[PDB]
Design a protein around this ligand. Structure first.
Ligand code: SF4
Ligand code: NA
Length: 213
DNA sequence: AAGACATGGAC
DNA sequence: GTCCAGTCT
């Protein structure tokens, strides 16, 4: 694992590589964001943005989602992988927003996690992007980057990774650092072919030096 | 607690 | 024809 100063050094670099890093899921409100991120699990944004382009046209409130037949909703998001579980989760989720949260998307992370289909990653994206609540959502990219760079150990769980970053990164920068890491991993330290040769971190990166050598 | 969920894009 | 883009029971 790198030293704290090194980690901050890696993050400060990513910041310069992707100064405009942001959430790339198209949404007009917290609710649209919630649905968008739920469909985003194990799927690409381009795909999700395409589907919600029409979905948010057909649905605009939770009453709209539970109004139609489950089979209908499934069809509406059929191109999304894991669409069956997602379609079902959305209906139970909307029902709960109505029954339990006065028909609104809760601003609490743990409260969001009670919603069917919502795990820690999803809840973290939502409170951060929609309500400015500092949080570090750990997805495939964040985890890969953290491990390749030696931010934490390869055996650490997503929670452990999240706790490592929170301990290092100042609460006031958790959100933006999260997006920078996403961008860094999505457009640079990719899973299939990382751009190590021209990376400003190879000089202190374990995965990068092994990749070259 | 591994296992099932699952379409679509990048090679 | 593989590999990659979280949650639940
Ligand atoms: S050196 Fe390679 S593996 Fe390390 S962070 Fe840069 S691109 Fe990722
Ligand atoms: Na949940």
């Amino acid at each position: 694992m790198l030293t704290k100063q090194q980690i901050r050094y890696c993050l400060d670099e990513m910041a310069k590589m992707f100064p405009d890093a942001h959430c790339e899921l198209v949404h007009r409100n917290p609710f649209e964001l919630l649905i968008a991120v739920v469909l985003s699990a194990q799927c690409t944004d381009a795909l999700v943005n395409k589907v919600t382009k029409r979905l948010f046209e057909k649905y605009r409130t939770p009453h709209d989602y539970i109004a139609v037949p489950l089979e209908e909703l499934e069809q509406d998001i059929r191109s999304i992988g894991l669409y069956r579980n997602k379609a079902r989760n959305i209906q139970k989720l909307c029902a709960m927003l109505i029954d339990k949260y006065n028909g609104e998307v809760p601003r609490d992370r743990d409260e969001l996690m009670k919603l069917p289909g919502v795990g820690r990653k999803t809840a973290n994206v939502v409170v951060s992007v929609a309500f400015g609540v500092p949080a570090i959502a750990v997805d495939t990219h964040v985890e890969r980057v953290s491990k390749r760079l030696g931010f934490c150990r390869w055996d650490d769980s997503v929670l452990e990774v999240e706790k490592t970053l929170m301990k290092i990164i100042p609460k006031e920068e958790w959100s933006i650092t999260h997006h920078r890491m996403i961008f860094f991993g999505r457009y640079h330290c990719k899973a299939q072919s990382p751009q190590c040769p021209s990376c400003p971190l190879l000089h202190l990166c374990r995965e990068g030096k092994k990749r070259m050598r």
